[PDB]
């Protein structure tokens, strides 16, 4: 049994999903309502691999709301995630993914540090897979645009994050990228990253972007961030790989292509109503890679926290989850040539 732990996206979207959760669609549901709403298993899921193997999952609604952050209700926000995790476990789910804010939250509040104790091998961030997909997207994109990745330049914004640092290890060792630009907030970690890599030019954001054929956006987007279309190279690909994805609407311009990063398309229809179904071109087949990771671990029978902590993702783990991804019928989302 795999699990997909997710969360609401706005107060209005929660009222949409409200009824299906046993609640009154037209009642007063305030931030305080969803703060006290308990976690619920909400959707039963049956995925069928390309090999023929059938697996079963549960989508667990955590009721976390990004407004709980906005209202500085960080302990309430922490609680939602941990409850959701604890709910997964009591119902005997073997491996669950924390999608969207869920894992960001689990990290920035060191939640590794209720009734019973949580088994962490029962959960995964799905980040190893997310990093793997993001890298297949760079590779794919470069082939599509006629760009030798061996000569090209990739800026990894957030290169010190769990996802970002995994992307750099792969872009270096696997694609053999030409120039790798590192970008992040913490100078110390940027130094330690480039030391492990043996390469990479550390740069501030507004020097990074204009060198880059590919930009891998994988960090908490700062406030007052000016992305000026006009400074970017004229064939440019921006891979929005973090949660939430907002580049699609904050960056627009001729020869600029924004691509949802870390998204996968399955080979067969899946019947569900998940967390970002509304932002997927093809909801019945498209999902976050971190969720798909949870599925790959259950297809393979690897019941462990395959992805966990910060900067632990290794090339070898990325390799293993990658070919599990392919074998079971998952393709990276790709550029859609309606690019005019």
Author numbering: 1 to 113, 118 to 344
Please give me the paper's original passages concerning this structure.
The earlier discovery of the pathway responsible for alkane biosynthesis in cyanobacteria allowed the conversion from solar energy to alkanes through photosynthesis, without providing external carbon sources. This two-step pathway utilizes two water-soluble enzymes, namely acyl-acyl carrier protein (acyl-ACP) reductase (AAR) and aldehyde-deformylating oxygenase (ADO). AAR catalyzes the first step of this pathway, reducing the substrate fatty acyl-ACP/fatty acyl-coenzyme A (acyl-CoA) into the corresponding aldehyde in a NADPH-dependent manner. Subsequently, ADO catalyzes the conversion of fatty aldehyde into alk(a/e)ne with one carbon shorter (Cn-1 hydrocarbon) and the formate as a C1-derived form. Here we report the crystal structure of AAR from Synechococcus elongatus PCC 7942 (SeAAR) in its apo form (AARapo), together with three structures of AAR in complex with ADO from the same species of cyanobacteria (SeADO), in which AAR binds either substrate or substrate/cofactor.
In this work, we solved the AARapo structure at 2.8 Å resolution, and modeled the complete AAR protein containing 341 amino acid residues. AAR is composed of three domains: the N-terminal domain (NTD, residues 1–130), the middle domain (mid-domain, residues 131–264), and the C-terminal domain (CTD, residues 265–341). Residue C294, which is strictly conserved in AAR homologues and has been identified as the key residue for catalysis, is located approximately at the center of AAR molecule. Above C294, a wide cleft that includes the dinucleotide recognition loop is visible. In the AARapo structure, we built five molecules, which show highly similar overall architectures, in an asymmetric unit. However, three fragments, namely Fr-I (residues R19–Q29) and Fr-II (S113–T120) from the NTD, and Fr-III (V221–D235) from the mid-domain, show higher structural diversity, indicating that these regions possess an intrinsic flexibility. In fact, we found that the mobility of these fragments is pivotal for the function of AAR, as they are involved in either the interaction with ADO (Fr-I and Fr-II), or NADPH binding (Fr-III), as discussed later. In the AARapo structure, this acyl-tunnel is broken by the side chains of M279 and M21. The N-terminal segment (H7–A37) containing Fr-I is more loosely packed, potentially hindering AAR–ADO complex formation in the AARapo structure. AAR alone adopts a loose conformation as shown in the AARapo structure, which represents the resting state (ligand-free) of AAR (S0).
